[PDB]
């Protein structure tokens, strides 16, 4: 709405019931207060599809979505007894993970969600969830800690026991230190079930409360801070979607700073501007102003449909940026079994954009022309020439140098699905 109202993106494996859980957080904030959705929750709950553990009113909503991809229509949120929360809910094998990173807000805190159990630990120790690439995109700028919720802590055979939770905390906490991040002041955990609740209030008698003394999830988020009176830092707005009516409609979060009705907004990628005809907040709407951390549905007066696409960011003329086509980069490859040959197709992961990329040629290695061996990458000698490459993609993608800012300028590469490399764009070319 105005400011202090989070940036949160769920991440987790697709199986993790993360959409059920993110729906239960959206599900009428004020707590219960719901003369229509109490009637919907009266059983409705599912066919075999998302399947059923109580958390639902939302699992049968995947059913009809047609489905297998996505349950929380790249959409939720709520408020608590502190602040408002956006939500944005990673993949059920969707793209809502793209939707965060370069899209809707740089989380002050993400969230990781994991589902400890027999057939879930197996697919959770593969570990290749909508955590993985899906926190790296997520980290081309910022998004971290995330807490971690340990879902599925009632169905399996746990029957409200007091075990497995710590065993998962150890394995998950070596999995967050990987790559090289920060400490553990920012890596608490919360047991949940999606099945029921727990994380918003401790007013359950669950069977965790006989042993668990600590704050709830929201209290371990609320250890950050607030602000006040909107209009604080620079204005930014990522597009989740576009369609048109009288004027174009766009949907998306606001990243920082302010939108009122009847301001100009600039879209740099296109090179156009518009007046916003209206703003919808995110909660109970009555014609009021918004804040980084709610969305806005907006109406757009005097621009075309084509002029904006999802994953772009709007700002004021004041604190803006720029971007171009193919490019040169200094990429650092890890240990992988495969070598990148000159031209090879990887998937890039800048931002919202995951796209196929040809690494056409190899211009220099440590200092030589050769295939991209460099398993542990730079010239070990003076200036770290990991490799210098040229990357080419299907359509011109909005990217800048890392030197102006490290966001748009960093990206990961992965061949199949093992992350071969990371780098920075050095220079722009047509």
């Amino acid at each position: 709405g105005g400011k202090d109202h989070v940036s949160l993106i769920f991440m987790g494996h697709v199986d993790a019931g993360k959409s059920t859980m993110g729906g239960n957080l959206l599900y009428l904030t004020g707590s219960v207060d719901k003369r229509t959705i109490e009637k919907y929750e009266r059983e409705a709950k599912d066919a075999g599809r998302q399947g059923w553990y109580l958390s639902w009113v939302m699992d049968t909503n995947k059913e009809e979505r047609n489905d297998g991809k996505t349950i929380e229509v790249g959409k939720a949120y709520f408020e608590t007894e502190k602040r408002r929360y956006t939500i944005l809910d990673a993949p059920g094998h969707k793209m809502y993970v793209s939707e965060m990173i370069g899209g809707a807000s740089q989380a002050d805190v993400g969230v990781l969600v994991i589902s400890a159990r027999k057939g879930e630990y197996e697919t959770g120790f593969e570990r290749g969830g909508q955590t993985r690439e899906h926190a790296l995109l997520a980290k081309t700028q910022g998004v971290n800690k995330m807490v971690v919720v340990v879902n599925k802590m009632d169905d399996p055979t746990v029957n409200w026991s007091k075990e497995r939770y710590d065993q998962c905390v150890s394995n998950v906490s070596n999995f967050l230190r990987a790559i090289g991040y920060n400490i553990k002041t920012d890596v608490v955990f919360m047991p949940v079930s999606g099945y029921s609740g727990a994380n918003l209030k401790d007013h359950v008698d669950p069977k965790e409360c006989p042993w668990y003394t600590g704050p709830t999830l929201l209290e371990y988020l609320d250890t950050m801070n607030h602000v006040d009176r909107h209009i604080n830092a620079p204005f930014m707005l990522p597009i989740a979607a576009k369609m048109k009516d009288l004027g174009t409609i766009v949907e998306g979060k606001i990243e920082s700073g302010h939108i009122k009705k009847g301001q100009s907004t600039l879209l740099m990628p296109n090179k156009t501007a518009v007046e916003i005809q209206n703003i919808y907040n995110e909660t109970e709407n009555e014609v009021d102003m918004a804040m980084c951390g709610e969305q806005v549905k907006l109406r757009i007066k005097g621009v075309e449909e084509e002029d904006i696409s999802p994953g772009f960011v709007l700002t004021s003329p004041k604190n803006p940026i720029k971007s171009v086509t193919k490019f040169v980069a200094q990429i650092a490859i890890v240990e992988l079994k495969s070598i990148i040959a000159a031209g090879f197709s990887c998937v890039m992961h800048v931002h919202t954009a995951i796209e196929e990329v040809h690494i056409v040629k190899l211009l220099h290695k440590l200092e030589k022309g050769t295939n991209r061996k460099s398993k542990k990458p730079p010239a070990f000698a003076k200036k770290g020439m990991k490799v210098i490459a040229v990357l080419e993609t299907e359509a011109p993608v909005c990217v800048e140098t890392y030197q102006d800012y490290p966001q748009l300028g960093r990206f990961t590469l992965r061949d199949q699905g093992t992350t071969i490399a990371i780098g920075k764009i050095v220079k722009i070319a047509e």
Binding site: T36, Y40, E64, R65, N66, D67, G68, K69, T70, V73, P91, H93, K94, M95, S98, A241, M243, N285, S338, I339, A341, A342, G343, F344, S345, V347, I354, E355, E356, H358, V360, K361, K368, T370, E392, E394
Partner: protein
């Protein structure tokens, strides 16, 4: 085994001949294609060529009459060398072109191929319609790409080493239940009507594309998307006829964005595309995969080739139809020196010229190395195949090298080199 890719110099070769025949560019209206089917008789054609000569003789307009008599008299002159139509038929190409090297010599091709039946062509127009042997060894359109999504659809085609996308639209189906009152349920009904309108509009534009004139242009047709937006496409009333019948694969993709989409076509092949020329899968990929294994299993273009080919040690050879490498002969004495399609130094390797000795190092000529690899590979116990740069990997070959790469049988080591330490 299938020789796939081995086939691809040969396919290519035909193709000049199809363009040069059809084109005959040379101006003048004196080009005769005569194809005579197996078991037809040769003088029924000789007598038609003589009845046309006698008519051609009435034109009496010196240039035009001389073209058509020169054209008929050339095909007639060749037809005499053949006794009968042989088994498999006769093809004959005759006509006066803008020949080069002021050496003249109208085109004269006369041969027996393998099996063009009942085609029986005699035309002297701009084009000979040689067809149905050309239909028979079809090569058409290939694989059909139809992409659902919740945001919008896509139609395209991957055809050999031709991928084409260029025909799409989008939808906002109604996903916004609306807010402000009303109801609950109402949206879900509005949702199922507007999704039915996409099941009509995607399937109809797919009928308006892929099934061209009274038959599907494409051999095969893949439905790709997510979350049963395609299963309600495939088992439907609106889609069916003759297209439901063709569907090879139903591929599940992620965020559906182009990578997912490609991986889609990819997994696909294997038993579909068919022929044995264009598609490769299982074979192409093996070539690339097997080199990956730091099993130095590559020849790829620019350093090791002829030598290894002379010395057994190659499973499958990967060459391109557009190769800018050849063989040259003439240099050094008491023996022979061989030149490869001369690069920045090969073209002017005149340096090898021992002026203070005589060693004449004059950059040979020009021979074609493409055709030789398609006529030898059994003696070496190896193989040979061909491809194109029509793609990411393709463009690597040109920049990294020229157009010739090999696939050592089993794990051999990257050929040592000075640069290597």
């Amino acid at each position: 085994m299938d020789n796939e890719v081995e086939k691809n110099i040969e396919i290519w070769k035909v193709k000049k001949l199809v363009q040069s025949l059809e084109k005959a560019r040379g101006n003048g209206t004196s080009m005769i294609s005569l194809v005579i089917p197996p078991k037809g008789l040769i003088p029924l054609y000789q007598k038609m060529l003589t009845d046309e000569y006698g008519t051609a003789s009435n034109i009496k307009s010196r240039v035009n009459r001389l073209s058509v008599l020169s054209a008929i008299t050339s095909t007639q002159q060749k037809l005499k060398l053949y006794n009968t139509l042989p088994k498999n038929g006769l093809v004959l190409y005759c006509g006066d072109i803008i020949t080069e090297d002021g050496k003249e010599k109208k085109v004269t091709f006369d041969i027996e191929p393998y099996k063009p039946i009942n085609t029986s062509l005699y035309l002297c127009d701009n084009k000979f319609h040689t067809e149905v042997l050309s239909e028979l060894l079809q090569a058409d359109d290939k694989f059909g790409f139809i992409v659902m999504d919740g945001q919008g659809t896509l139609f395209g085609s991957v055809s050999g080493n031709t991928r084409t996308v260029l025909h799409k639209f989008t939808v906002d189906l109604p996903k916004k239940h609306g807010r402000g009152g009303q109801s609950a349920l109402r949206f879900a009904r509005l949702r199922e009507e507007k999704r039915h309108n996409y099941v009509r509009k995607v399937a109809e534009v797919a009928v308006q594309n892929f099934i061209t004139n009274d038959k599907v242009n494409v051999k095969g047709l893949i439905l790709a998307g997510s979350a049963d937006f395609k299963t309600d496409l495939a088992k439907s009333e609106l889609f069916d006829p003759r297209l439901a019948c063709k569907v090879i694969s139903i591929v599940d993709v992620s965020y559906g964005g182009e990578n997912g989409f490609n991986q889609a076509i990819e997994l696909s092949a294997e038993a579909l595309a068919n022929v044995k020329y264009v598609q490769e899968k299982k074979l192409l990929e093996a070539y690339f995969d097997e080199i990956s294994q730091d099993t130095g299993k590559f020849c790829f273009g620019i350093d090791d080739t002829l030598k290894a080919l002379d010395l057994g040690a190659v499973e499958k050879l990967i060459v391109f139809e557009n190769l800018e490498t050849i063989r040259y002969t003439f240099k050094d004495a008491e023996d022979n020196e061989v030149i490869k399609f001369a690069e920045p130094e090969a073209k002017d390797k005149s340096f090898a010229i021992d002026k203070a000795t005589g060693q004449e190092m004059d950059v040979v000529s020009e021979e074609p190395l493409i055709e030789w690899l398609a006529a030898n590979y059994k003696n070496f116990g190896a193989t040979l195949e061909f491809i194109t740069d029509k793609s990411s990997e393709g463009a690597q070959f040109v920049t990294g090298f020229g157009g010739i790469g090999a696939m050592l049988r089993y794990k051999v080591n990257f050929e040592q080199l000075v640069d290597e330490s």
